[PDB]
Design an enzyme around this catalytic site. Structure first.
Site, PDB file in Angstrom:
ATOM      1  N   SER A  31       0.785  -1.228   0.000  1.00 39.27           N
ATOM      2  CA  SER A  31       0.000   0.000   0.000  1.00 39.27           C
ATOM      3  C   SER A  31       0.818   1.280   0.000  1.00 39.27           C
ATOM      4  O   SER A  31       0.376   2.305  -0.542  1.00 39.27           O
ATOM      5  CB  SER A  31      -0.941   0.025   1.226  1.00 39.27           C
ATOM      6  OG  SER A  31      -1.752  -1.135   1.275  1.00 39.27           O
ATOM      7  N   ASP A  71      -9.777   9.077   7.576  1.00 39.43           N
ATOM      8  CA  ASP A  71     -11.142   8.863   7.118  1.00 39.43           C
ATOM      9  C   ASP A  71     -11.675   7.501   7.526  1.00 39.43           C
ATOM     10  O   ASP A  71     -12.894   7.306   7.552  1.00 39.43           O
ATOM     11  CB  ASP A  71     -11.205   8.997   5.586  1.00 39.43           C
ATOM     12  CG  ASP A  71     -10.567  10.284   5.074  1.00 39.43           C
ATOM     13  OD1 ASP A  71     -11.153  11.372   5.311  1.00 39.43           O
ATOM     14  OD2 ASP A  71      -9.495  10.211   4.415  1.00 39.43           O
ATOM     15  N   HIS A  76     -10.922   2.076  12.607  1.00 41.04           N
ATOM     16  CA  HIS A  76     -11.193   0.717  13.057  1.00 41.04           C
ATOM     17  C   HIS A  76     -11.096   0.654  14.561  1.00 41.04           C
ATOM     18  O   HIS A  76     -10.062   1.062  15.114  1.00 41.04           O
ATOM     19  CB  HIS A  76     -10.198  -0.252  12.429  1.00 41.04           C
ATOM     20  CG  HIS A  76     -10.452  -0.515  10.972  1.00 41.04           C
ATOM     21  ND1 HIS A  76      -9.538  -0.219   9.983  1.00 41.04           N
ATOM     22  CD2 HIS A  76     -11.519  -1.060  10.345  1.00 41.04           C
ATOM     23  CE1 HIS A  76     -10.027  -0.580   8.811  1.00 41.04           C
ATOM     24  NE2 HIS A  76     -11.239  -1.073   9.001  1.00 41.04           N
TER      25      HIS A  76
END
Ligand SMILES: [Ca+2]
Ligand SMILES: [Ca+2]
Ligand SMILES: [Ca+2]
Ligand SMILES: [Ca+2]
Ligand SMILES: [Ca+2]
Ligand SMILES: [Ca+2]
Ligand SMILES: [Ca+2]
Lengths: 194, 194
Positions: free
Chosen positions: A18, A167, A170
């Site tokens: 990522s 944004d 968790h």
């Protein structure tokens, strides 16, 4: 201030997860694209291929490295290797990550492709022993394969939360408990009323 | 303080995304499991089935709702419906999230299964227009289908970082620029030295 790129094209492969793919960003905003732009502004005739895959573990990287290399128009001149974070976040053994990155580096040796190893750091809640075993993979393997080590490249993110995506939230276990305290009265009423 | 549950079991289906699945948490730590424990402590004889799937969009949920229901031992007495966050996070159209949630509620209406709609709010990265079209989906559909609205049950997470997982950092576009500024000199030197 800018220097016109001259010289033959230099192909750089950005092989990572990522942090190379540009999670939730435009492709032209990802690290490989912005790094390309910064290198070219300094006069290097560089093309950076983004081979980042969000979610890739060191195992997943090893599975595809030969195919990704074969799919380029000739061998790249330099590989940027940035894997390990997802192994750590998934609690996979540090020893497996070390072994998979070792193999990747063996494959690049076999193809005579130089490499820069992007170091990663383990989350503190995995414990000190995992931290020492995982964190040392990158300098150890850079030394063994005579590759450069790039220090934790997300260090700016640690010190400026404004640089980190906020944004997507968790919950921790305690966060779940708060979610329950906020909803249990309503859910209790609904079930009692069935 | 605890009240012993009595009477027949009440089956509750928690149909949602990572906020129900318990992303990077143990099974007993997920919202469905902790909700079940809280309800049973209050004397309700409830079984909450965790049908959360991390990553599920409204379209993914619609695709599996029938399969999930048809796989239960009898139809649930109550469904907790919690989808939309992934549509939003991926910038998928708000109108398509609305349409898919509508269809889900229609299928639950047809099976006469009561539903609680867990509302979701668009992240600021999405802009004001998207937010107004997305955020209204949940009260609009709850009113249309005469379902309860559970307001924004991760509200406590917005305000207390200690309740939110901090181990996984993804850069903003600005964060990527900082990562380039942290590494460009070393990469430039390595390429120059090829
Ligand atoms: Ca009905
Ligand atoms: Ca009806
Ligand atoms: Ca009916
Ligand atoms: Ca130099
Ligand atoms: Ca040098
Ligand atoms: Ca150097
Ligand atoms: Ca040179």
């Amino acid at each position: 201030d800018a220097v016109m790129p001259t010289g033959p094209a230099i192909d750089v492969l950005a092989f990572g997860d990522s942090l190379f793919a540009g999670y939730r960003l435009d492709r032209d905003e990802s690290y490989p694209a912005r790094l390309q732009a910064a290198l070219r502004e300094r006069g290097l005739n560089v093309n950076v291929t983004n081979a980042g895959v969000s979610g890739d573990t060191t195992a997943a990287g090893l599975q595809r490295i030969d195919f990704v290399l074969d799919s380029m128009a000739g061998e790249p001149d330099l590989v940027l290797l940035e894997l390990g974070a997802n192994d750590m976040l998934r609690g996979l053994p540090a020893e497996e990550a070390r072994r998979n990155l070792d193999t990747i580096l063996q494959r690049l040796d076999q193809r005579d492709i130089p490499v820069m190893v992007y170091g990663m750091r383990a989350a503190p809640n995995l414990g000190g022993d995992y931290g020492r075993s995982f964190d040392s993979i990158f300098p150890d393997l850079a030394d063994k394969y005579d590759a450069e080590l790039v220090p934790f490249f997300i260090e700016p993110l640690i010190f400026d939360r404004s640089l980190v995506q906020q944004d997507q939230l968790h919950p921790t276990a305690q966060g779940v408990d708060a979610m329950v305290e906020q909803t249990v009265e309503q859910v209790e009423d609904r079930i009692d009323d069935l």
